[PDB]
């Protein structure tokens, strides 16, 4: 009974509903925003966020 | 250096008294009123002595010229250097005397001499009043 109790505890430790709301939020957030603006903004921030090794 | 040394020791004892009154006010329970009065009077008269001694040796302090050490590194301690370097007053005192001057607001000179004569007259009047009644 003890060992199956820790098996139950460790199984419960690994996740239920919270993960599926989080996956949902990911899906509508991805669907709402188009990839063109994201790629343009990433290219425009590539110069600022990434510190070049030759910048003294 | 002697004048600045005396200023140092007196200001150090003043800061010690400030630390004292601080750690006896920081207690959750307020001590008796009389101890607070004693601490207040001692620290405040000590502040008076600080002011008087700083007044006495203005020439020695003015003659001294400030210069950073050759060994002192400014690259790593520039923040610490700037901390002591800055001298501008706290703003609230600034607008405090600005409103004070706003409220206060040859003519000025003759009002000044009129104040002189009022002061002298009042002093003489109270000397006469004190002399009128025997206080011994």
């Amino acid at each position: 009974l003890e060992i199956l109790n820790e098996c139950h505890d460790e199984l419960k430790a690994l996740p239920l509903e919270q993960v599926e709301f989080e996956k949902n939020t990911i899906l509508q957030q991805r669907s709402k925003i188009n990839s063109t603006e994201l790629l343009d903004y990433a290219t425009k921030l590539s110069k600022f966020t990434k510190i070049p090794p030759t910048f003294d | 250096g002697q004048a600045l040394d005396a200023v140092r020791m007196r200001l150090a004892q003043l800061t010690h008294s400030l630390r004292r009154i601080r750690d006896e006010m920081s207690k959750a329970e307020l001590p008796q009123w009389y101890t607070l009065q004693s601490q207040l009077n001692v620290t405040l008269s000590q502040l008076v002595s600080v002011t008087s001694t700083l007044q006495h040796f203005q020439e020695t302090l003015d003659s001294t010229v400030v210069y950073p050490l050759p060994k002192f590194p400014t690259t790593s301690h520039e923040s610490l250097v700037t901390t002591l370097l800055r001298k501008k007053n706290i703003p609230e005192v600034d607008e405090w005397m600005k409103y004070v001057r706003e409220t206060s607001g040859e003519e000025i000179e003759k009002l000044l001499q009129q104040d002189r004569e009022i002061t002298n007259w009042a002093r003489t009047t109270f000397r006469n009043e004190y002399g009128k009644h025997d206080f011994k």
């Binding site: 957030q29 343009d40 600022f48 | 703003p91």
Partner: protein
């Protein structure tokens, strides 16, 4: 030519990211005392949605103004702690900005 109000408001928003600018602005009494400045700050909130957010140059101010938004119900007091707190909370705030955008 005279720049449009778009350009000046965008440049103001992107300049709000500077800690020195924020410290200077909060140093003066009448800037925070006047409700006009905070009204404009709340008006600026509508740039967090596209396509306006695509025109920003530094996303950090996006939180800073929001942080400045918090300043209207947190108090001026705390002005001294502003550089220390931004330096300390830069990591987690950058992480949450990345989570908001990069994911």
């Amino acid at each position: 030519p005279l720049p449009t109000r778009f350009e000046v408001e965008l440049e103001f928003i992107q300049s709000l990211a500077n800690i020195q600018y924020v410290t200077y602005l909060l140093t003066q009494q009448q800037i925070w005392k006047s409700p006009n400045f905070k009204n404009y700050l709340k008006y600026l909130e509508y740039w967090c949605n596209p396509p306006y957010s695509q025109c920003i140059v530094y996303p950090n101010c996006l939180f800073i103004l929001k942080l400045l938004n918090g300043f209207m119900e947190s108090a001026l007091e705390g002005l001294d702690e502003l550089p220390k707190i931004i330096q300390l909370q830069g990591p987690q705030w950058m992480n949450e900005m990345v989570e908001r955008w990069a994911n």
